[PDB]
């Protein structure tokens, strides 16, 4: 509906809409040949259908081609300083499609205006609608037009015969914010069956990771979505469909040490998996420093030859 | 439905704008891989 709207507001009064609680599909918009410019900052166009955003903003206006480049972070220009300024850390996509045949008319468009004068520059996502006469010189005009005192707004007069530099261009700016909140806008990705007690990848409402999901004794309040430990890592999530809290545990890992007598005697080796139970790895001895595979555990006691740990040592007979 | 021909024609018409006129493009790609060099400049050799 924002893309198909018949009329687009003026730049000095760019129209902002909020989008939430729906499933978006950016593949159609990106793959379409209609849009002329499609630039995404802080995100890539090919992955917008894989992410989830807390809230989407859609800002619509109409400019000309020569200044379409001014809709970008850290730009300098009349729009960049007086009409519509984007934040430096902008996260979103800017789409412009030529619109000669929608807006431009014989005689010129008098309904499309842009601010040409202002006392100071604008701030990001700030809209100014005041029509106070600008004091160009040092003479206070007290709201009276004349020399060194101009009306800030200035008309466009889009003529269909004008060159592409001055031709109408409809621009829509999709602004996404990726913060800690229950995301309401998500791509068209079908959900799958949930599995527990296994080392699996998980994508919970746009939060990716790898680990084991288990039933949790934690009691989340009915506003919290995910929990974190002391070290600030996501260790508990809420299922977006059943509202069931699941603990996240990183899959069992560790170091691997090779215990060997010198090759200069024999080629046999033993493998110690540090801090790892060897019912998780797929004769065999379980120690405090992990478990040892390839070494025979005995009742005897000798002087330590190869230190294993926790009072356990290994040697070649 | 929605099946369209994969190709499209430039239609280089002689009196066109500078953005539509035919420009010949040659791209030279150099391989700096470890190998005996075959192409060098006109740099003259010198006694060892």
């Amino acid at each position, epitope marked *: 509906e924002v*893309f198909n709207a018949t009329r687009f507001a003026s730049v000095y009064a760019w129209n902002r809409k909020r989008i939430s609680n729906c499933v978006a599909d950016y593949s159609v918009l990106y793959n*379409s040949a209609s849009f002329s410019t499609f630039k995404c900052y802080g995100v890539s166009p090919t992955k917008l259908n894989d992410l989830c955003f807390t809230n989407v903003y859609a800002d619509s206006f109409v400019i000309r081609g020569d200044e379409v480049r001014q809709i970008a972070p850290g730009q300098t220009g009349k729009i960049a300083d007086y009409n519509y300024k984007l934040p430096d850390d902008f996260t979103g996509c800017v789409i412009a499609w030529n619109s000669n*045949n929608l807006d431009s008319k014989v005689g010129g468009n008098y309904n499309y205006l842009y601010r040409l004068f202002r006392k100071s520059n604008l701030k990001p996502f700030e809209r100014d609608i005041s029509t106070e006469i600008y004091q160009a010189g040092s003479t206070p005009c007290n709201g009276v037009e004349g020399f060194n005192c101009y009306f800030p707004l200035q008309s466009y007069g889009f003529q269909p015969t004008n060159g592409v530099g001055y031709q109408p261009y409809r621009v829509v700016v999709l602004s996404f914010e990726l913060l800690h909140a229950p995301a309401t806008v998500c791509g068209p990705k079908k959900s799958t069956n949930l599995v527990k007690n296994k080392c699996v990848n998980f994508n919970f409402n746009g939060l990716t990771g790898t680990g084991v999901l288990t039933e949790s004794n934690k009691k989340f309040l009915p506003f919290q979505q995910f929990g974190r430990d002391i070290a600030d890592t996501t260790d508990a999530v809420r299922d977006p469909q059943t509202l069931e809290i699941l603990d996240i545990t990183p899959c069992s890992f560790g170091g691997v040490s090779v215990i060997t007598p010198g090759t200069n005697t024999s080629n046999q080796v033993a493998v110690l998996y540090q801090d790892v139970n060897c019912t998780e790895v797929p004769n065999v001895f379980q120690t405090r420093a992990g478990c040892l595979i390839g070494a025979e555990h005995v009742n005897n006691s000798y002087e330590c030859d190869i230190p294993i740990g926790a009072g356990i040592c290994a040697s070649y007979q | 439905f929605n099946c369209y021909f994969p190709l499209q024609s430039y239609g280089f018409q002689p009196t066109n704008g500078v953005g539509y006129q035919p420009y010949r493009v040659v791209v030279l790609s150099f391989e700096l891989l470890h190998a005996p060099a075959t192409v060098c400049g006109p740099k003259k050799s010198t006694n060892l």
Partner: antibody
Amino acid sequence: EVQLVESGGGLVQPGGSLRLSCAASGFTFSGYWMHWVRQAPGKGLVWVSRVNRDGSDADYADSVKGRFTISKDNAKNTLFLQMNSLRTEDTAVYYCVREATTFGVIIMPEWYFDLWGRGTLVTVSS
Amino acid sequence: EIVMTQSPGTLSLSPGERATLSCRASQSDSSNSLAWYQQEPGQAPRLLIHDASSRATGIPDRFSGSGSGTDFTLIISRLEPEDFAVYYCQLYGSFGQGTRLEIKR
């Protein structure tokens, strides 16, 4: 099939008022821009007016500036063209014409017509 | 604003001989979005070619023209007894004076 039927017209004294209707059948009226084209008796064609998908904007020609009003009643599937202070030189036949649209992600008209309905002759004289 | 000028004003040929016609935009270029219409005197005008290159579906393949910049030409491959009409070119805001494709005797 797709056709446009024009209704109204006739002899009206100079300075009078008249309203013309354009009923469209065979296609979806809502998605297409519409225009009006005049044809003077034994003369060339001249563009008159232009209307959007809902009628927000108008593209009234200089000849008909301030005297002709076009309306697009999408709910009851009709186009309307009503004028005031009509002058003698405007004697012609009117053509209700359509604007081609791609109907893709963006409607994107192309300023070329597709079908022409049967014209309606209008006359003004004393 | 923009004025369409048609050349030649009139053009008569044999019933089989082909012909070409050229329109002239007064100034500037309009992205080559030009249309030709053939109007039989009794009937309403009919679209022939749109965007100055591509011919509308249902029109005979014989009608095939192309142009760019100031000039847009349409050329007809052959002729039959249907050219007794006026060919008007149409850009955004104006129609051409037209040309009567006559039959020679």
